[PDB]
């Protein structure tokens, strides 16, 4: 039923065969005299494959038995080429085991016998899986780079190790170094592998991308390797001049911004689930980038698009507060008086006196809903909430408006259930537009509550109004007109009014549902306020409160750059073509030092 | 559409012209042989202005190319005098670039050729703007002082550098040092520039004020430079005697207190938006000052003025609780019974039995409102809330009282809307008078809540009473008389009473507005209490809670010293005239050392 049990069963099974096979046992214990008393007379199987398809040399290489390994090579030099014939270690040679163990003399001897420096260890243990503690790759050169042994690295290059070699996952020796825990020390090894590159501008090793379309520089950002990212940044920044403390450095800004449909560091950071990758935006070439993208273009277009959405939702409620109308007509208010409806449905509701003002208003609510779907539906085909569930709500709001239209033209009785959902989904999606020390942050987070509060009540008071605009105000008239309805709901937002409560009669199916959602949102905002009031002052967790919002702003800034056309929102940085720099866009960033 | 893009475009444009111009390129790369192969045959333009109006020497000075700069000076000595003819660096000479780079040999050579030590670099990059990383000034002497190179400082003084020189912003070399980040090291440079002063008591360099009326000593306080402030304080304090550990030092206390209409350190600290400047009050010459100003004179006059305001507001409500009276008269309570008013308006309300007791009370409410305007309106002409929005509320309260008077004499029906606003604005402005370890601070902040609570209810219960004194107590009688009204509102302050809630009838326009403000203030005080209960115990943020109140007390102490006459509130410190000290007021401060 599992897999980890198998390899745990095999390692125990391996030590069994070593304990049984006297050749393998002598290769483990480095019993030199027992190898001569076994290989010359009475010759035993020397190509003896153990439990993991290992030769006697593989066991002599696992335990760094140089004396025992040299006897196994002089009596049978063909053991050097032999790889592990198992499934867990398919491809691993005696050289791979000697490289990771940093056995320079055994590596020197294995290379002297002519070991393959291009052997791919494609075994299941060497995979990049969470159940494998190390990921070094496949080639023995890739092993030497990860163990930090610069001596074996160059010693393998001298015997024809291809640095351009990629594993099953399309990772070069450079990609794998970035996926190593020792970040500060891998920078030293990374520069060693680069020195053996072809030296030509074309076919560079740092440009060879991952199988998932990630150059090593780009992979460092997505993986959140801060030390590798800053190191690789040194090779793509030019210091313009030195003016005392000022150091105007010109950054590359090539693989850090968008033209790639999906290839761009910014998009890969805001859409990845990796918590460590969020720190990459904050680096000295990137933090200047998104800060310029939000000060200009970003913030104004977000509030311009906001004011357009505030007007589009207040118009939808303008057509709801004055919904269509005939009183009950039916005597159904006499039997089963528990239902006191004065239901209102309307078809030749063409009769126009002030009804065309709402009709053109209802037409705005329709043409705006399809436009919402014309910018979100073609976008789902090409989904990570960093930046708020605004997209999940904006598509379900337009769905309720279309259902209300489908509700219309058929004269259905349940015209309230799909229309009321659009009121809360339309308003509470406005509070997402709130993206525009402990003192001002308490006040800063308090203004988010004051914005999120007034938005919630304006969506539930308009809802509760429709829920009891048809019903009778004789009993339970908490929302008999709009001005009240807002005031009742506002007090209901603080639990001052006892909640529309009535059990003699019955009240529509939507009140027992809409009021249930209103009671939960009211406490979560008041719980999120307390955390915004205490979490802001407790400790520097206000920073943790802080870059989550900053990352939400960066995630929103990248969102506004995808759908907006090229005529608006010009490209960041400065193009290089005349003034001479080759048509990449560079960012001029200067810093003072103290 | 921006400006930072331009200079980013120009620096890229600069490197283009350097890359193109072989003379400028040779000046950058220090190509000595390429300068001789360009200047002697085949002579090229040597006065070649680059992209930023720079000469070949300016480029040879930017990159510290001494060998290349000396060839450009021997073949064309007129390049030394030439300044940058650009807009970004208008005025910068080859000496300015050699001073900041601390190139002593190039500075020695430029001075030997006779470079202007008084050249003002008035370029746009050298401005004191937030988009400029450094502000050093204009003169090359001011550059040497900011880079900490005391060798170039004296070397420039030897060639006639004027220390008395001011930039466009009227800043001497001393003002600029205070605006430098390296505070601990600028104190060393500051004493060097003072040694070259005229040595005369008159025309001292430390007395030359800013263009915005700030001596360097005064600027250190407004800017919050603690290291410079304590350093400059050493020269204006005299140790009276040494008595073992005791060291009675006599402080100057001249530029730290008021006679200057607006010139005084205290006023400049409490009115500036700079958060760092608040720490200056707390220094050892200033913290003793405001502490003496608040123990005596400050605290008593604040509570005396408080008790006068408590009586002035309780008298205004005394005339409201017994407002004027005729019942409805009209049959309008029969049709549209939704309005159950028993409206009360009165003109020959002269008829006097107990009505003169209120008339003289109404006369107090008028003569007091104009006095409030006679001490605040002439003060707005000569506005920062540090110390609470008491001034913003005290002027709008007196505005409502005057409107109520204008409401009167015309027999208007809306006599409640402007009168009720004065009840909450009159009381809730009292809680501002609350300025009078974790244990006693929890109790200290709890007594602020107990004071702010009882003040809010006494303003809203009196309001809610007037809102329903005219209305009918048959239905919704939460405030039928004053003793109740207080009790209902008190319970309403804790959300125990369901809130005056009624939907059958209608209730005046002021209840749906006054009760909305009452529900928000009730939760903010209870939210501010929780933070006062947890924030006080969490960590030493109670100190952060702490000096904000202390600064509010200091801001209030300076407020009480401006309007009070000279006969009250004597001047701080002790005058020097006979006993011999020259008519400045000194503060005697002694300290013990351990
Ligand atoms: C010890 C085993 N014997 C052997 O000859 N090779 C194996 C080496 C084990 C390394 C497993 C690496 C991994 O966890 O992926
Ligand atoms: C490098 C430029 N070339 C040059 O000849 N002078 C400039 C010096 C730049 C300093 C900008 C100072 C500031 O940021 O205000
Ligand atoms: Gd009833
Ligand atoms: Gd009744």
Please work out whether the CB of residue A98 comes within 6 Å of at least one atom of ligand 1: no
A330 Cβ below 6 A of ligand 1: no
* Tokens describing residue B253: 């206390």
From CA A519, how far away is CA A525, in angstroms rounded? 10
- Do A590 and B531 make contact, defined as CB atoms within 8 angstroms? no
Q: Which member of A241, A245, A574 has the closest CB to residue B63?
A: A241
B541: which chain A residues are within 8 Å (Cβ-Cβ)?
Answer: 438, 537
Whole-angstrom distance, CA of residue B518 vs CA of residue B529: 17
The angle, 0 to 180 degrees and rounded to 10, between the axes of the packed helices B511-534 and A511-534 is: 40
Phi, psi of A589, deg, nearest 5: -130, 125
Q: Are B539 and A534 in contact (CB < 8 Å)?
A: no
Q: Which residues of A touch B185 (CB under 8 A)?
A: none
Six-digit token pair at B592? 């013990």
* One-letter-per-residue 3-state SS of B487-500: HHHHHHCCCCCCCC
CA distances from A327 to A324, A342, A418, A470 (A): 10, 5, 21, 8
| Nearest ligand (C-alpha, residue A11) | 1
Q: What resolution (Å)?
A: 3.8
Asked if A150 and A192 touch (Cβ cutoff 8 Å), the reply is yes
Q: Which residues contact A152 (CB under 8 A, 6 or more apart)?
A: A99, A102, A104, A107, A144
Mutate which of B52, B510, B531 to disrupt the A interface (most A C-beta within 10 Å)?
A: B531
Residue B397 three-state SS: helix
- Chain A interface mutation, best of B11, B130, B179, B513, highest count of A Cβ atoms under 10 Å: B11
Q: How far is CA A267 from CA A252, A277, A453, A544, A561, in A?
A: 17, 11, 32, 21, 11
Q: Could you tell me the two tokens for B555?
A: 């801001």
CB A221 within 8 A of CB A269: yes
Question: C-alpha distances in angstroms, A126 versus A60, A101, A531, B331?
Answer: 20, 16, 45, 95
Residue having the nearest C-alpha atom to atom 15 of ligand 1:
A125
Cβ atoms within 10 A of the Cβ of B200, count? 7
Which residues share a beta bridge with A575? A585
Inter-chain contact A246–B102, Cβ cutoff 8 Å? no
Under 8 Å between Cβ of B254 and B266: no
Nearest Cα residue to atom 11 of ligand 1: A125
Find, among B222, B123, B135, the residue nearest to B171 by Cα.
B135
Among B498, B301, B320, which residue's Cα sits nearest to residue B407?
B320
SS (H, E, C) A387-439: CCCHHHHHHHHHHHHHHHHHHCCCCCCCCCHHHHHHHHHHHCCCHHHHHCCCH
Return the CA Rg of chain A.
Answer: 35
Distance from CA of B322 to the nearest CA of A (A): 29
DSSP three-state, residue A245: coil
Contact A588 B147 (CB under 8 A): no
| Distance of CA A424 from the midpoint of ligand 2 (Å) | 56
* Residue A57 DSSP SS3: helix
* Other residues' Cβ atoms within 10 Å of the Cβ of residue B18: 24
Q: Does ligand 1 have an atom closer than 6 angstroms to the CB of A62?
A: yes
The number of the ligand nearest the C-alpha atom of A94 reads 1
Count Cα neighbours of A133 within 13 Å in the Cβ-side half-sphere: 1
- Pull the structure tokens for residue A72: 């196994």
What one-character-per-residue DSSP string does B416-481 give? SHHHHHHHHHHHTTTGGGGG---HHHHHHHHHHHHHHHHHHHHHHHHHHHHHTTSS-TTS--TTSS
B252 is in an annotated binding site: no
Query: Which residue owns the Cα nearest ligand 2 atom 1?
Result: A241
Which distant-in-sequence residues (6+ apart) come within 8 Å of A169 by Cβ?
Answer: A128, A210, A211, A212
B388-427: string of b/e by CB count within 10 Å (b at 16+)?
A: bebbebbbebbbbbbebeebbeeeeeebbbbbbbbbbbbb
Q: Which two tokens stand for residue A194?
A: 């680069």
Q: Using CA atoms, how far apart are residues A76 and A43, in angstroms rounded to an integer? A: 12
Q: Which SS3 state, helix, strand or coil, does residue A585 take?
A: strand
Q: Which of A537, A580, A594 sits opposite B535 (nearest CB)?
A: A537
Chain B residues touching residue A478 (CB < 8 angstroms): 503
Half-sphere exposure of A25 (CA within 13 A, CB side): 9
Order the strands of the A246-251 sheet from edge to edge: A237-243, A246-251, A585-589, A574-575
Q: What pairs with residue B83 in β-bridges?
A: B93
- Two tokens at A357? 């003002």
CA of B473 to the centre of ligand 4 (A): 10
Cα–Cα distance for residue pair A469/A485, rounded to 1 Å: 10
Contact call for B539 and A539, based on CB within 8 A: yes
Q: B581: closest CA among B252, B177, B159, B162?
A: B252
Name the residue in chain B with its Cα closest to that of A476.
Answer: B503
Residues in contact with ligand 2 (CB, 6 Å cut-off): A 241, 243, 246; B 52, 54, 58, 62, 89, 125-126, 132-134
Between CA A277 and CA A225 the distance in angstroms is 8
**CA atoms within 13 A of residue A425's CA, in its CB half-sphere:** 19
**Nearest Cα residue to B188 out of B153, B224, B218:** B153
CA distances from A117 to A56, A121, A184, B181 (A): 20, 11, 27, 56
Contact B349, B355 (CB under 8 A): yes
Nearest to B519 among A296, A496, A576 (CB): A496
Contact A92, A84 (CB under 8 A): yes
Comparing CA positions, the residue from A464, A364, A468 lying closest to residue A423 is A464
Q: Is A89 exposed, middle or buried (0-12, 13-18, 19+ CB in 10 A)?
A: buried
**Vertex A466 angle, CA A463 and A469, to 5°:** 145
- The residue of B15, B279, B511, B551 whose CB has the most chain A CBs within 10 angstroms, and thus the best one to mutate to test that interface, is B15
The reply to whether residue B62 touches residue A241, judged by beta carbons under 8 angstroms, is yes
Q: What is the DSSP string of A519-558?
A: HHHHHHHHHHHHHHHHTTTSSTHHHHHHHHHHHHHHHHHH
B577 and B276 Cβ atoms separated by less than 8 Å:
no
State the closest ligand 1 atom to the C-alpha of A126, by its place in the atom list counted from 1.
15
DSSP A236: G
d(CA B317, CA B295): 33
Using alpha carbons, list the distances in angstroms from residue A150 to A44, A65, A191, B187, B528. Answer: 38, 22, 11, 50, 61
Distance set, CA B57 to CA A474, B109, B141, B429 (Å):
92, 12, 20, 67
Tokens of B402: 């005057």
């Amino acid at each position: 039923e599992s897999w980890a049990q198998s390899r745990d069963e095999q390692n125990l099974l391996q030590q069994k065969r070593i304990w049984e096979s006297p050749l393998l046992l002598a290769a483990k214990e480095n019993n030199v005299q027992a190898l001569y008393k076994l290989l010359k007379f009475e010759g035993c199987e020397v190509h003896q494959k153990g439990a993991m398809g290992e030769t006697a040399l593989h066991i002599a290489a696992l335990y760094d038995n140089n004396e025992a390994a040299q006897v196994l090579m002089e009596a049978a030099p063909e053991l050097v080429f032999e790889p592990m014939t198992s499934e867990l270690y398919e491809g691993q040679t005696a050289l791979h085991i000697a490289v990771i163990n940093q056995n320079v003399n055994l590596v020197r001897a294995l290379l002297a016998r002519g070991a393959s420096v291009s052997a791919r260890a494609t075994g299941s243990v060497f995979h990049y899986r969470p159940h494998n503690l190390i990921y070094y790759g496949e080639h023995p050169l890739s092993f030497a780079a990860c163990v930090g042994s610069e001596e074996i690295v160059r010693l393998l290059i001298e015997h024809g190790a291809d640095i351009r070699a990629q594993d099953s996952l399309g990772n070069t020796v450079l990609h794998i170094l970035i996926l190593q825990p020792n970040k500060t020390f891998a920078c030293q090894m990374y520069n060693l592998l680069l020195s053996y590159d072809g030296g030509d501008h074309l076919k560079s090793l740092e440009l060879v991308p991952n199988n998932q379309g990630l150059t090593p520089f780009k992979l460092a950002g997505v993986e959140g390797n801060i030390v590798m990212f800053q190191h690789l940044m040194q090779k793509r920044k030019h210091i313009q001049w030195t003016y005392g403390p000022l150091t105007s450095t010109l950054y590359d800004l090539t693989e850090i911004d968008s033209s790639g449909d999906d290839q761009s560091l910014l998009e890969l950071i805001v859409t990845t689930k990796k918590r460590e990758a969020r720190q990459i935006l904050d680096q000295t070439p990137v933090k200047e980038l998104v800060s310029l993208k939000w000060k200009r273009y970003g913030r104004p277009y977000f509030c311009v698009l906001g004011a357009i959405y505030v007007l589009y939702i207040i118009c939808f409620t303008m057509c709801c507060v004055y919904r269509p109308l005939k009183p009950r007509i039916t005597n159904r208010t006499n039997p089963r008086d528990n239902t006191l409806l004065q239901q209102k449905l309307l078809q030749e509701a063409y009769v126009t006196p002030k009804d065309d003002l709402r009709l053109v208003g209802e037409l705005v609510s329709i043409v705006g809903a399809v436009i919402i779907l014309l910018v979100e539906i073609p976008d789902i085909f090409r989904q990570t909430i960093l930046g708020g569930p605004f997209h999940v709500i904006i598509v379900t709001y337009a769905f309720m408006v279309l259902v209300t239209m489908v509700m219309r033209l058929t004269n259905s009785d349940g015209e309230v259930v799909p229309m009321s959902f659009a009121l809360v989904l339309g308003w509470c999606n406005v509070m997402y537009f709130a993206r525009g020390m402990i003192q001002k942050m308490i006040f800063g987070d308090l203004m988010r509550f004051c914005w999120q509060m007034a938005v919630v009540i304006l969506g539930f008071a308009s809802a509760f109004y429709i829920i009891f605009q048809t019903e009778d105000p004789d009993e339970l008239g908490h929302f008999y007109d709009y001005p009240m309805a807002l005031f009742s709901t506002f007090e209901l937002f603080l639990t001052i009014i006892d909640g529309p409560a009535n059990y003699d009669v019955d009240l529509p199916f939507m009140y027992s549902i809409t009021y249930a959602a209103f009671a939960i949102i009211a406490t979560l905002l008041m719980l999120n306020l307390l955390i915004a009031m205490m979490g802001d002052t407790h400790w520097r967790v206000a920073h943790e409160r802080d870059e989550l919002w900053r990352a939400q702003v960066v995630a929103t800034t990248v969102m506004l750059e995808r759908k907006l056309p090229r005529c608006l929102w010009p490209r960041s940085g400065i193009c290089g073509r005349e003034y001479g720099l080759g048509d990449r866009w560079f960012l001029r960033v200067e810093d003072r030092q103290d």
